[PDB]
Amino acid sequence: RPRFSFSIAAREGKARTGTIEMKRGVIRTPAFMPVGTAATVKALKPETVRATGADIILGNTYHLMLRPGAERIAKLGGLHSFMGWDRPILTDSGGYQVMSLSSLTKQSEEGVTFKSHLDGSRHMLSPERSIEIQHLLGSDIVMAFDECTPYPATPSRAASSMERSMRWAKRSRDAFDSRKEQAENAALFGIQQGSVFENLRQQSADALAEIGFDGYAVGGLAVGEGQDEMFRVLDFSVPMLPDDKPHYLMGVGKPDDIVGAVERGIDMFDCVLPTRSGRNGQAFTWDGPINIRNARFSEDLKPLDSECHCAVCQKWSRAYIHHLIRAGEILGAMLMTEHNIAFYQQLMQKIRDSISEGRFSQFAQDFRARYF
Amino acid sequence: RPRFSFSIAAREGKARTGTIEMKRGVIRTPAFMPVGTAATVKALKPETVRATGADIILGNTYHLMLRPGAERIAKLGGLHSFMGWDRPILTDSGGYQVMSLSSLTKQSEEGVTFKSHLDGSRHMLSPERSIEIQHLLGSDIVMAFDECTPYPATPSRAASSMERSMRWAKRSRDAFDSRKEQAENAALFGIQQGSVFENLRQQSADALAEIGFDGYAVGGLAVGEGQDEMFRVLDFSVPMLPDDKPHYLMGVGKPDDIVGAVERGIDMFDCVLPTRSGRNGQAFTWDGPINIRNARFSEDLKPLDSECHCAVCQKWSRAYIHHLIRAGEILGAMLMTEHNIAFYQQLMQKIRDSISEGRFSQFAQDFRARYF
Ligand SMILES: CCCCc1nc2c(=O)[nH][nH]c(=O)c2[nH]1
Ligand SMILES: CCCCc1nc2c(=O)[nH][nH]c(=O)c2[nH]1
Ligand SMILES: [Zn+2]
Ligand SMILES: [Zn+2]
């Protein structure tokens, strides 16, 4: 296959369905990417992740550069080899988490300095170092290093951050291109910022398109602005991005959000909601999510979801999983996570199928009526 | 298959190898039984447990009667259906754990009263109620309800407890036989007591043989007396039990203990050591156990064990598992537990093969030289 080739096979309104071809495999879009926090998709073997239907997973750079170490993983043969996943892997830049989990972060035009929330040790992450770390990990889709603008944000603050991210985007681009092996085997995604402001989003989009990237992400929307607000921003933001390249909405994962996002032109998604919902007891069903810990499920012999075709719904009951979660057993988290990720992949498949068949709008309507 | 049929195919010294045929399947002996504490073999799907080579697992009655409830599991279709394991299941009587984990236990000739270490609720466990609970769970091999004698124990105290357990054994036997469906589809094992005293062990054995059971367990030896002492007791205790029936050493699982126990006539084993060793970081190898958390394994690309043929040793390195455990990831516990249980099953296979080939004594010598 080629280094990177995105092809749109069908459309309906702003929705698109197609594929991204990469050296390690093909990614069907719209796509949902399970998240591997510390080089592991929580409670699942890589084969199980693939069995759910996932074509690609997301690796968190921040965590990896700390816990095991970028240099160490490279010496061990790279992330794919390390964790046993041989398909594409998209890694975030680490910038976001550094501004969330890290402590005593010092930001400048050069990058960000911070103390690990583990060893308390210091680190200086920059566009150049972020790109290098993602290379060391052997990432297939590299995210440009940026600064996620806090919500709410004033027009001036949002402008400054956006302008800086755009400057950092250029640096990421040049850093990526100078590394021959990386530039030739991996792809680079730029990230649009600008908060909820249209003019800022347009400037960011022009600058990003000006730089030129393999894909474009809509950043800064996984900040708690509400679905209505998020949708509003997506309405005018996605059209600004180049149409012939993937559109990746970072950190958005609720099912209804995904459907609405695809209706607005998004091709890629990622979220820990599915995995975290494995331990908290939240299981996704076509009739809406349920909390398996609820007493009403203690003797429910039915599977998590009546239609889901995942291995969990074929073999175990709600009653058993209810028991497992309340008892704090690891198997509970394993079964809940496999189901939820399988559910998500089934959702993406139904979206891809309905787009290819020109009945996505109807699917969305049907989905919402039942889900809510 | 029959309700229960134990056949010895080969011998060497006191060691035996053969099979136990039961309705739900055949059990190869000597056998190692993975433990399912709360209706789950820690961090493993039933299929994975079977994939390691296990022919039977052990279910803990104490825990089950509390967390999910005996009556509830029966209404849900039984333990096999509940957890998804369709092969034989041996359940302990619950008496032991009640004297270990429980609180405010009141003991009498009728049974034992206690408060759950969970809800603090009270319960009265007796030979009759224990047998009933194991029936409700759908246990294939039922353990007689007894009183595990504390170590150290004076001759008089050990005698009284043993004599009482023998009285309880008769009650278990009658309770089991009165329940037609149970008596016809499940087996009942009596448990020998008597602490470290030969005459007490002999009395217990005669009484147990007098009652008549499908198998005989050597109880009271998983109390911290030391391998030397345990071996000493096994030397004169096992020969006391009927030769044509299985000999089950309860709670003994260290590899060297298993080998030495088989050399002394034991056919069945069980232990949480393998599972608990999954989280603590202890991995069994033919060169002795190792603690995967040790820094020397951070960049070790080799599998947990150079010879092990389990799925974990084929796919992941010590370096990766080292990372997983120190990072506290669920996958770490999953991989460590699959390997350790697979290692145990490989041990049992090597024991069965060496017995059938009349070279077990040599195998034991070779095993120890390398293991230690
Ligand atoms: C918990 C939600 C994470 C979503 C996210 N947004 C962003 C963004 O806007 N810029 N860069 C990033 O790595 C990033 N990650
Ligand atoms: C943690 C070790 C458990 C071993 C055990 N011994 C015994 C025994 O001697 N009698 N009855 C039992 O259930 C039992 N379980
Ligand atoms: Zn399912
Ligand atoms: Zn192994």
Swiss-Prot record, chains A, B:
Binds 1 zinc ion per subunit. GO terms for biological process: queuosine biosynthetic process; tRNA wobble guanine modification; tRNA-guanine transglycosylation. Belongs to the queuine tRNA-ribosyltransferase family. GO terms for molecular function: metal ion binding; tRNA-guanosine(34) queuine transglycosylase activity. Its cofactor is Zn(2+). This is Queuine tRNA-ribosyltransferase. It is an enzyme of class 2 (transferase). Substrate binds at D92, S93, G94, G95, Y96, D146, Q193, G220.
